[PDB]
Every structure is written in structure tokens, then in C-alpha cells.
Amino acid sequence: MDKFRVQGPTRLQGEVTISGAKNAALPILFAALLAEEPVEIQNVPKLKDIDTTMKLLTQLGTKVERXGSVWIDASNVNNFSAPYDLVKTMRASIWALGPLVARFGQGQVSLPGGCAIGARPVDLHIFGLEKLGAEIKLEEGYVKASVNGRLKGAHIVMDKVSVGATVTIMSAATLAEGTTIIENAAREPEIVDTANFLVALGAKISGQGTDRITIEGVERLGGGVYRVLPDRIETGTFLVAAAISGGKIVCRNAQPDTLDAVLAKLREAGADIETGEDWISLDMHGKRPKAVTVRTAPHPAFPTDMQAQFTLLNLVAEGTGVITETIFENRFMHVPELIRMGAHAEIESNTVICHGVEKLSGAQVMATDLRASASLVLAGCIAEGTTVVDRIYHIDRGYERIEDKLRALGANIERVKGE
Numbered sequence: 001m002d003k004f005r006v007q008g009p010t011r012l013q014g015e016v017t018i019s020g021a022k023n024a025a026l027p028i029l030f031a032a033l034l035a036e037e038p039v040e041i042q043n044v045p046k047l048k049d050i051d052t053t054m055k056l057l058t059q060l061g062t063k064v065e066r067x068g069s070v071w072i073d074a075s076n077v078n079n080f081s082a083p084y085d086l087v088k089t090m091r092a093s094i095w096a097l098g099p100l101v102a103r104f105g106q107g108q109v110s111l112p113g114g115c116a117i118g119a120r121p122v123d124l125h126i127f128g129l130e131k132l133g134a135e136i137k138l139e140e141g142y143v144k145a146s147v148n149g150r151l152k153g154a155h156i157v158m159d160k161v162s163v164g165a166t167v168t169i170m171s172a173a174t175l176a177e178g179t180t181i182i183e184n185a186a187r188e189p190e191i192v193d194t195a196n197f198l199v200a201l202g203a204k205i206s207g208q209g210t211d212r213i214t215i216e217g218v219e220r221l222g223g224g225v226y227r228v229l230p231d232r233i234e235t236g237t238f239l240v241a242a243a244i245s246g247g248k249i250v251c252r253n254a255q256p257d258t259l260d261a262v263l264a265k266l267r268e269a270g271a272d273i274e275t276g277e278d279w280i281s282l283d284m285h286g287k288r289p290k291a292v293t294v295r296t297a298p299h300p301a302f303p304t305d306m307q308a309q310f311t312l313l314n315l316v317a318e319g320t321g322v323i324t325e326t327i328f329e330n331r332f333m334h335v336p337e338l339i340r341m342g343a344h345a346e347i348e349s350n351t352v353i354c355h356g357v358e359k360l361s362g363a364q365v366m367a368t369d370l371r372a373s374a375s376l377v378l379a380g381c382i383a384e385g386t387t388v389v390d391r392i393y394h395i396d397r398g399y400e401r402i403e404d405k406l407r408a409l410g411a412n413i414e415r416v417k418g419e
């Protein structure tokens, strides 16, 4: 059980190169199962889920190799069943189902059990494929799908916004007969990236990024080269790292237009920001940030995945700020940990009232959410003394070696194996 020992306070300044988004690389890697010709997917991060995905694709008959790119040859996929042993640690494995049924007419994926029913993650994927004409078979532990001929385009109205089901329906629809229209489609940049990857292969999709996506099915998809977009949450995390430490940073290989809400909030906190084609710079000019008011909402609004980071920013800012979370009902576990580090905050339902303090104090802390855990590491960078963040494997699964990037910005951080 690795931990990070962080010693502060340190001002974080320098340059950081943003990694590709795991949340775009994953749907793209599964969409590659539709490709009849070789594909090179560039800017893919080296994270556990990518390894799990490559192993799963290999089990299906895909030829896969990687470095910064992942090379895929799905010309000879010949096993349409994703087994429990390879999918048990990754819910994203459901994304193998739609491409297999759309291209080969059959697919099966193992699913984890549970006593709870109703609004389970996989449900909308199942009903989406059923609307496209697939026959679905369910038994506890798995979902099997098949189609007699080709899937058929359909007009689908999503009752609730779902990134996962939008990807499943959009990807499978590329090989359906006719036109598919997805109403109330998820608008996330990762949806746009996946749609653009499919178009690079020969698909016909429009409306990605808006609440209505239209797909005109084609007979087959080819191959090509595609570069995964930058991780917007990693970008925001490093921008906040500079903003809370009186720092100055340049994030390279960034995509500013995926962070409009975040950049606006950082400007309200007092940051001097400039943006280029593929970069963002932030300079606090040695100043403490000013408190801000934040309400999370679906993209393109302020992202819930930046909420913990901005809570930390408010907790060391000048003034009182309120953070309101409207996406998740219990995403404030970072707060008690920051209170133990000296922060002043009150939890009122789905809001946290923050009263900024000048300095935090080191403590032994831990959070299970990836973003909350990364925020504790950042707090450790600016807190007086030593902070030990436990169970950092959560961070390791979503950030490509964060301690090395932070160390290059001036952080005093060490990975400790055990104690």
C-alpha cells in the first residue's frame, strides 16, 4: 500500500505536459473494434485501465502493441466474448458489447453482481442496443447481444444523460442500416473525441458536443491515425496546484476550449491566464487566491471532477466561498480531511461553506475518490510540515505519475512503500 509523503509549504512553478484523457482513450480503444484496417491511437496514457483494455482486446483476437501510441489491428477479431477474469476490475468493459454486435452480430460481456436493481450503470447500454434492433439475453453476471442481420438506425430519447450509453449507442450506430438520432446526448469533450475518431475511420456523425447526435450508418469502417485529446481534469488539477501556491505554470499539450468554465473560475480567484492553441499559462504573481462561488453542472458547465480541487482552493483563499455539488450526492469526503489539516468549512446538504485560512498543517489523510485524493496531495504541497496521503493507488490509476510531474514543479514529494 504505497503512500505519498509530502512536505510543504512549496510554491509550484514550471511546466507540465498534460497526458491524453483516459476517459477518451478507453471509448476510442473499444471503438477500434469496428476498424477493419490498422489504427494508431496516439497520446494514450500509461494507466492500469489501458493495460486491462489492451489485454481484453487481445483476448478477442485483436493484435495490440504500445509504447506513447497504441497500435491496433482488429482485422481478425474472432472471439466475441469478454470473460469475467479480464473485465472484473473495469466497468468500461461494457463498451466492447456494441462494437461486437454492430460489426460481427454477436457479443457477450461479464458483469459484476450486486443486490441493488434499478438505474444500474449498464442498463442504458442494454436498452440502447435493444432500440437499435439487438436481441438481448440477460442472466445474472452477464449480458449477451446478437442481431439478425445489421442493427437498424433508430430515434432514441435518453431519459437521463449518460456518457457511457451515448458512447455505446453512437459507436454501434455507425454500422447500422439507416439514421440514428440520440436525443439528450451527453456533451462531454470525450464524447466529441470518440465521435471524431469514428469519423476518421469513415463514420458519418454530426452534432457531437450538442444534445442531439445524428449518425448515418455505413457498411464498414477503415483505419487510420488519431490522437486522443488532452486530459482536461488533469489540466485543471495542475492549474489549481499553481493557483493555490502563489505559483506560475504553463500546461503544454492542453486543449483550452474544453475548460472554459474552469478557466473563468480561476480568473475570478485572481489568476492571470493566457491560452494558446495547445497550452494554458497561469500566474498568481505570488498572491493568495480570492474565494469563488462554484456550482457543478453537466458539461459545458463547471465539472464535478474539479469540485474537490476548487474546495481546497477556497479553503486557503481570502474570503468565504461556497461550493455546490449538483451531480453527486456524497462527494465531500475531502472536507473532513482538510478540516483535520486546519481548514474552516461547514457542510450544509450538498454545499460546503468555506472560510479561507492562510495556511494548513500537515496530517495523515486519505480519500477514496481519485480527485479528492489528488486534492489532498496538493494540500500537502502547501501545508506546513509533513502530510502523508495513504492509498495513493487511487491516484495512480487516473494520473500518469503525478509525483514526478509535481516534483518538476518544485514539490517535495516521495512515494513510500508501506511505512
Ligand SMILES: [NH3+]C1CCCCC1
Pocket: 065, 071
Ligand atoms: N508495427 C507497429 C508497432 C511497433 C511500432 C511501429 C508500428
Ligand SMILES: [NH3+]C1CCCCC1
Pocket: 079, 080, 081, 106, 107, 108, 144, 145
Ligand atoms: N455463444 C456466444 C454468445 C455471443 C458471443 C459469442 C459466443
